[PDB]
């Protein structure tokens, strides 16, 4: 089809990124042993966990 932009491959690239992004946020939780490593993961859950750690 078009030689000048492989769009089937640009989709597969963009979807490979969305997979390896999830894979790093999983791997983070396994290696640290903590589910909420950063405040993006649960703002209620970080805030409550700090009050309960306190």
């Amino acid at each position: 089809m078009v030689v000048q932009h492989n769009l089937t491959a640009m989709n597969a690239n963009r979807q490979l990124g969305i997979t390896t992004g999830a894979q790093a946020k999983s791997s983070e939780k396994l290696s640290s042993g903590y589910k909420i490593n950063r405040a993006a993961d649960d703002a209620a859950g970080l805030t409550i966990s700090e009050k309960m750690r306190s």
Partner: protein, 54 residues
């Protein structure tokens, strides 16, 4: 996502579909050979004068 979809959109306006353009190229290539051959022919048509009570 928006960058993939607008790359997809622009690629369709602007990139050669190489399968379509190789139809159009190949038609023209053969027509040129037929038109060269028909010009090589057309230069030889005036030869008929030379036998003509000359």
């Amino acid at each position: 996502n928006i960058s993939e979809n607008t790359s997809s959109a622009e690629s369709r306006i602007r990139d050669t579909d190489m399968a379509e353009e190789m139809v159009e190229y190949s038609k023209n290539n053969i027509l040129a050979q037929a038109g060269q051959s028909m010009l090589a022919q057309a230069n030889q048509s005036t030869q008929g004068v030379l036998s003509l009570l000359q």
